[PDB]
Short mmCIF file of C-alpha atoms in Angstrom, two decimals:
data_model
loop_
_atom_site.label_atom_id
_atom_site.label_comp_id
_atom_site.label_asym_id
_atom_site.label_seq_id
_atom_site.Cartn_x
_atom_site.Cartn_y
_atom_site.Cartn_z
CA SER C 1 -14.09 -27.82 -74.58
CA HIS C 2 -12.98 -25.91 -71.47
CA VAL C 3 -15.13 -25.50 -68.34
CA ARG C 4 -15.34 -21.73 -67.84
CA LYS C 5 -19.04 -21.01 -67.56
CA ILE C 6 -20.89 -20.95 -64.27
CA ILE C 7 -24.52 -19.95 -63.98
CA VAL C 8 -26.86 -19.96 -61.01
CA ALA C 9 -30.56 -20.64 -61.53
CA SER C 10 -33.69 -20.50 -59.38
CA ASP C 11 -37.49 -20.50 -59.56
CA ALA C 12 -37.70 -16.83 -60.48
CA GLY C 13 -33.95 -16.27 -60.81
CA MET C 14 -34.41 -12.94 -59.05
CA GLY C 15 -33.69 -13.78 -55.42
CA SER C 16 -31.31 -16.40 -54.03
CA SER C 17 -29.72 -16.60 -57.47
CA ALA C 18 -28.49 -13.02 -57.03
CA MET C 19 -26.55 -13.74 -53.84
CA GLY C 20 -25.17 -17.10 -54.94
CA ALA C 21 -23.91 -15.49 -58.13
CA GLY C 22 -22.25 -12.55 -56.38
CA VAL C 23 -20.30 -14.61 -53.86
CA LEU C 24 -19.13 -17.21 -56.38
CA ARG C 25 -18.26 -14.49 -58.83
CA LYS C 26 -16.12 -12.67 -56.29
CA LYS C 27 -14.19 -15.78 -55.33
CA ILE C 28 -13.54 -16.62 -58.98
CA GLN C 29 -12.28 -13.12 -59.73
CA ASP C 30 -10.12 -13.20 -56.60
CA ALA C 31 -8.55 -16.46 -57.78
CA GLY C 32 -7.34 -14.61 -60.88
CA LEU C 33 -9.63 -16.66 -63.12
CA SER C 34 -10.72 -13.80 -65.36
CA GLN C 35 -11.30 -16.48 -67.98
CA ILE C 36 -14.27 -17.84 -66.05
CA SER C 37 -17.57 -15.98 -66.52
CA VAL C 38 -20.42 -15.76 -64.01
CA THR C 39 -24.07 -14.90 -64.53
CA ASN C 40 -27.52 -15.80 -63.22
CA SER C 41 -30.87 -16.50 -64.83
CA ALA C 42 -34.18 -18.29 -64.35
CA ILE C 43 -34.23 -22.09 -64.63
CA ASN C 44 -36.57 -21.83 -67.60
CA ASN C 45 -33.60 -20.07 -69.22
CA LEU C 46 -30.32 -22.03 -69.31
CA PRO C 47 -28.16 -22.08 -72.49
CA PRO C 48 -27.23 -25.67 -73.56
CA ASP C 49 -23.61 -24.53 -73.85
CA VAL C 50 -23.36 -24.02 -70.08
CA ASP C 51 -20.71 -26.19 -68.45
CA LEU C 52 -21.62 -25.70 -64.79
CA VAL C 53 -25.06 -25.16 -63.30
CA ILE C 54 -25.54 -24.25 -59.64
CA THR C 55 -29.02 -24.38 -58.06
CA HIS C 56 -30.82 -25.25 -54.84
CA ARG C 57 -31.23 -28.99 -54.35
CA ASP C 58 -34.98 -28.47 -54.49
CA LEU C 59 -34.63 -27.33 -58.10
CA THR C 60 -31.48 -29.22 -59.15
CA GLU C 61 -33.70 -31.97 -60.58
CA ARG C 62 -35.21 -29.43 -62.96
CA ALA C 63 -31.87 -28.10 -64.16
CA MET C 64 -30.50 -31.60 -64.61
CA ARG C 65 -33.47 -32.32 -66.79
CA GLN C 66 -32.99 -29.37 -69.10
CA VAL C 67 -29.38 -30.42 -69.43
CA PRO C 68 -28.63 -33.74 -67.69
CA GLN C 69 -25.46 -33.72 -69.75
CA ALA C 70 -24.29 -30.63 -67.87
CA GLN C 71 -22.53 -30.48 -64.53
CA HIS C 72 -24.85 -29.67 -61.65
CA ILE C 73 -23.98 -28.66 -58.13
CA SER C 74 -26.63 -28.66 -55.43
CA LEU C 75 -26.80 -26.29 -52.48
CA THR C 76 -28.57 -26.76 -49.15
CA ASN C 77 -28.76 -23.23 -47.73
CA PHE C 78 -28.54 -19.73 -49.18
CA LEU C 79 -25.68 -18.67 -46.90
CA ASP C 80 -24.07 -22.12 -46.64
CA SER C 81 -20.56 -20.66 -46.68
CA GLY C 82 -19.04 -24.08 -46.01
CA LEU C 83 -20.50 -25.56 -49.20
CA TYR C 84 -19.60 -22.47 -51.22
CA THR C 85 -16.03 -22.54 -49.95
CA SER C 86 -15.64 -26.25 -50.71
CA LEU C 87 -17.07 -25.88 -54.21
CA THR C 88 -14.75 -22.99 -54.97
CA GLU C 89 -11.65 -24.86 -53.88
CA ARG C 90 -12.74 -27.75 -56.06
CA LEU C 91 -13.28 -25.67 -59.18
CA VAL C 92 -9.85 -24.13 -58.72
CA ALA C 93 -8.38 -27.62 -58.42
CA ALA C 94 -10.24 -28.69 -61.58
CA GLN C 95 -9.06 -25.55 -63.39
CA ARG C 96 -5.39 -26.40 -63.05
CA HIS C 97 -5.95 -30.03 -63.50
#
């Protein structure tokens, strides 16, 4: 049971989800974590095997519901680089640990 799956979800999963996914994905690849996979999809579609779910706070309630047993991270803004940076550092820390 290793956390390696990160998926971003949204209302339609065809807008903000695309950018969130790309940035996170790039950082993960840069960190040499080829073992971690990144994809995006609509909220209505989230595999129960997902370990990490990243969505906008306005829809985090929904994702939690589908899988309240999963780990959810809430965002505030689409380009909130500060939050993205913090989250990335954290995941890296959790990866080693």
